Design a protein around this nucleic acid. Sequence first.
RNA 1: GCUAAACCUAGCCCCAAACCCCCACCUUACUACCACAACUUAGCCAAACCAUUUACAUAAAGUAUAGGCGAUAGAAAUUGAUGG
RNA 2: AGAAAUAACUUUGCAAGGAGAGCCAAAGCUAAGACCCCCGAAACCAGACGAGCUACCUAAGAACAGCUAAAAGAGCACACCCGUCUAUGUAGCAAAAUAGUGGGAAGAUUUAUAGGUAGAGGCGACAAACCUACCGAGCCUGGUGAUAGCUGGUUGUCCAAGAUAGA
RNA 3: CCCAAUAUCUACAAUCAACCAACAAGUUAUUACCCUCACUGUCAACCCAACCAGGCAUGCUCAUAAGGAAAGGUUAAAAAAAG
Lengths: 243, 215, 45, 79, 117, 95, 87
Amino acid sequence: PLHKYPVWLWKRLQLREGICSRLPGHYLRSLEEERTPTPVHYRPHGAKFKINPKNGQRERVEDVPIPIYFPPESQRGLWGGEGWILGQIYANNDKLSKRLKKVWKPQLFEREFYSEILDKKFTVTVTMRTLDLIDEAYGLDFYILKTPKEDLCSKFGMDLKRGMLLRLARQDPQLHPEDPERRAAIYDKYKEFAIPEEEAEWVGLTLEEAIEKQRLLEEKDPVPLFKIYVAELIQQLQQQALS
Amino acid sequence: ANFVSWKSRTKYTITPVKMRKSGGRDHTGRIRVHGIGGGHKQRYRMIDFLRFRPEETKSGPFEEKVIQVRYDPCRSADIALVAGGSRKRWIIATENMQAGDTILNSNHIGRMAVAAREGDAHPLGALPVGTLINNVESEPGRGAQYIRAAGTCGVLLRKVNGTAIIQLPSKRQMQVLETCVATVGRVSNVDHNKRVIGKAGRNRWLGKRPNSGRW
Amino acid sequence: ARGNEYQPSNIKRKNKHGWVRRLSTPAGVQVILRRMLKGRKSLSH
Amino acid sequence: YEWGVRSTRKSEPPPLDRVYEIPGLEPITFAGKMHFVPWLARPIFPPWDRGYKDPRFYRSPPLHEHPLYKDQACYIFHH
Amino acid sequence: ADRMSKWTSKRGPRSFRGRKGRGAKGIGFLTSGWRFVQIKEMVPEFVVPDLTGFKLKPYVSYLAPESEETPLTAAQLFSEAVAPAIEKDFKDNLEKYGFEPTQEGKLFQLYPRNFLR
Amino acid sequence: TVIVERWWKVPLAGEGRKPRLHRRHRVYKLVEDTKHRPKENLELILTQSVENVGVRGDLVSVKKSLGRNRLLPQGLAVYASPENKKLFEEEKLLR
Amino acid sequence: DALRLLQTGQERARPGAWRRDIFGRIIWHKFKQWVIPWHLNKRYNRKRFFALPYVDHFLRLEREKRARIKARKENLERKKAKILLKK
RNA sequence: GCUAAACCUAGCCCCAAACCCCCACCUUACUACCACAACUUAGCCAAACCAUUUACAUAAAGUAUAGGCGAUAGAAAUUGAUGG
RNA sequence: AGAAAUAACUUUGCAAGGAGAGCCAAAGCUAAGACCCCCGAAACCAGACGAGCUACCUAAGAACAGCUAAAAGAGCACACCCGUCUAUGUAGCAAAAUAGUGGGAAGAUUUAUAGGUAGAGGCGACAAACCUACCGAGCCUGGUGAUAGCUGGUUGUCCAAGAUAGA
RNA sequence: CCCAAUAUCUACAAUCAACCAACAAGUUAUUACCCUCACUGUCAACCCAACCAGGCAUGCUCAUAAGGAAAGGUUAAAAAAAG
Ligand SMILES: [Mg+2]
Ligand SMILES: [Mg+2]
Ligand SMILES: [Mg+2]
Ligand SMILES: [Mg+2]
Ligand SMILES: [Mg+2]
Ligand SMILES: [Mg+2]
Ligand SMILES: [Mg+2]
Ligand SMILES: [Mg+2]
Ligand SMILES: [Mg+2]
Ligand SMILES: [Mg+2]
């Protein structure tokens, strides 16, 4: 026979049926939405069209992203967007020589980074690209706060983002006690990434963590029906009395 | 393979412990070194090589007297049970060690070379030039790793500022800090070379087996 | 002379083909799932 | 020469999940669903103390805190 | 080489034959040297009533009126259990009428069940 | 960063669809390796002084390693951003 | 049960929870009253109450094998309604 | 004359529609009851060997293009979408 | 056990146009009709299952009469293990046995029990020996209806044309 | 079918274990507990060899107190087998 929905619509169907159905709207929107990562390992074609030399006509061109592997060890660091390139090469860079296996891996370092909204020093593994992006962004905090989920591609980075966004949203005093002026300075410096708390709690959560959070949020000890029935009795008795 | 290596003891004691043979099998399960397996069951006596170890809450050079000098399956030399203070230790003995003797263990570098008895432990610098030593250590406060086998003499060659050059039995030199503690003499069980084992059964008893292959 | 390669032993049979040995590795869970799918009523030895 | 090979000691505990070291965050751990799940954070539970203490699983206080504990070291000669 | 027949205590070598029970509850624990200690508390003490003078028998006469199936529902129980006390006291803060808010300090806990049929 | 480009043209895909790739679309050429590229120098400003490089208030182009391991993570320097340019001009106007 | 609903509003006397076996199947798991907490139980933490990825495919085939069984039972049940209306 | 020979339906195939469902049990599974963990399809096969290579709505179009320019591979812009 | 396109041929419609969009058009277009089989390798690659047989190893056990000789891989010889030579047997009692004759039989011996090593891998007192009766490379499922210039087949009636230059 | 925790210890063989002779080198003190016999195997001519002159560890009997039946009836040809 045949299903009533294709195979790739099953995920989107599941996101509407059960516990996943009660998640807040904005989290679902942030989850379903897809964005292409910024190019990292390939030179993107500048324009939508191009003249090729072999014939001379105006042919369309697209940029097809290289597929890159992120081993789980990166999820504990900030690799930027970089990663492994698993593929093949021609031996002598001539097409008539053997097709050989090849893996290109980034050059990783360990370093220390100071987060001001967190006022904490983290030890993180990174790559030269991550340092250059941080410098171009004028600080680690800005780099983690303005970059979107897709370019970071690091659960650690998204957790940092959730912490910083929650710290800004609450305006909680725990950043720098005994100097509120420094608190106000730091908080207002990043005043642009100020989103409400209800949206701050869910930033970066994977789907499973979201389901667990919703369950814990709604799980509750059933109310004794004694209270319910006595309430109904009291309502009926009051109605009878006022009549 | 669930292979918890037997060498799991932490506390030190003179009582023999229960060896488990390997047969050449490493933790994975495959023949890593051919020609090993079988042979007589053995127990292990934890011979202590830091021959200058002062007992709890004590210091300064200490004297110990031996009790017996017995065969040992694992070694090639003959171990000896030395008693000192309130402590017994298994230590590799030299050739002319009899039950009842006494031995000194010191770290005290004297003004000049102290004539040392043929079983005592002294820092390299403390000895004179041209003597024979055993149980040398690469660096101080580490333990004896170099000469330990049966019937092997290690000559001391020279001393310079803060170091000493010693000759290992393989006919080559090495430098070591003068505060490294060695023992003067020749390791016991001399002429262990001349052991005609006679028949393949003896090899099997020791632990070796004949293995074709070794790819 | 051959033919008697099966020297039965309950310990061995339960150790190298049993429920827990299958469930102690992804391949074994795949085996159990195949035999659940095909309909078997003897999933594990 | 220390005694006790490395591969026989208890273990180095697994590297902690980094979510704990974000000052404002309270992680999502699998303590809510009473069973391990490999895609959440390993909780940290209180040290459990039995209100009673069953004789079959008693654990004596260390030798120091026994009522009959003397600093000076006796030398007994028992059988 | 038999895998269809059930697996019970009669099957394996000595060790298996001993370990595997037969659906029978336990009442005690093994101490040192394979010695068994029984506990008087883990042995179900039956509670049989005094049947003397009882005017009911295993069966009921065929001369009995029929009726309708009316299963007891929480509402029905509450209606004649506590409601009349409320109404009587409604003519002039819930434990007085039998409500039990928590179930740690009673011998027969309702949820979870700490007792037996 | 390693930059690679394909050896085999990937057929176009359209506007909605996404390209379907084949076993030959994973062969690659090494366009370059950004680390071999000639070194670069970054632009920052200072909150303090160090006589080897300069004194407070002014722009400085310093080597990336030197400015990342020493000048930045101590308070000496800040990123030459279009928000702290406008701030340090006051620090000289007051003088 | 009536007194349970009144006094604690719980439905089932014995506590339990919906979990996933190691086979992906959704099961209702009945709790076994023990004495030590669940994180210190070397036996209960050998159980896998989750499902790794390799079961998803087998979760599909099963879902299909029981749809066929449904369809054949439906289609047949209508053929036997044509025949019963052709005599 | 034995042996046999004959029969109908039990069901099933392809569509359409609709998104489908008390106790014990991961230890030796079906056993009431004690201190680690998951995250590029190679190749058969064609080239009459084989080594680069070799497939996984309609129309434009088997066109541009790719290719030991051999075998073969191959778009897009735009167009419009209860039954036997 | 003969599935289908490129043309062509036959019969229809309409005909400088045909076609129910896209295609063709210097009588062409649109539609239909006709024509291209079955069984079979040794193999290859991927993922599972196997060391209850056998090879080796580990843990903890067991056996070895009697005589001769006294600490020995000692001699004769039972239990036990192996399998020299001959005969029986060859769908056999047995997919390697039986009867006799033989080698070892306190050792490099033999053996019960649980564990380990996994397939281009293991193990090997090297014989290409053994890894569940068939190992110069296990077995099962999948790619797989592998491919096969090779072998074998290819089913109603009747008629008619029909054979040995060469590259 | 087992064992409450912690520290301590735990140098010298087995061989009738004594003579000679060797090498292959072979638990407790403190703390906690005054609880009692539950649960399972128990059969047979039996298991691995498709049904079987084959395979099957240990204790004891060493020719049996235990266990069994080499000939369905006949005649006494050849060829064959064992003596
Ligand atoms: Mg299109
Ligand atoms: Mg080919
Ligand atoms: Mg074996
Ligand atoms: Mg074929
Ligand atoms: Mg040919
Ligand atoms: Mg003719
Ligand atoms: Mg009996
Ligand atoms: Mg008899
Ligand atoms: Mg007879
Ligand atoms: Mg007869």
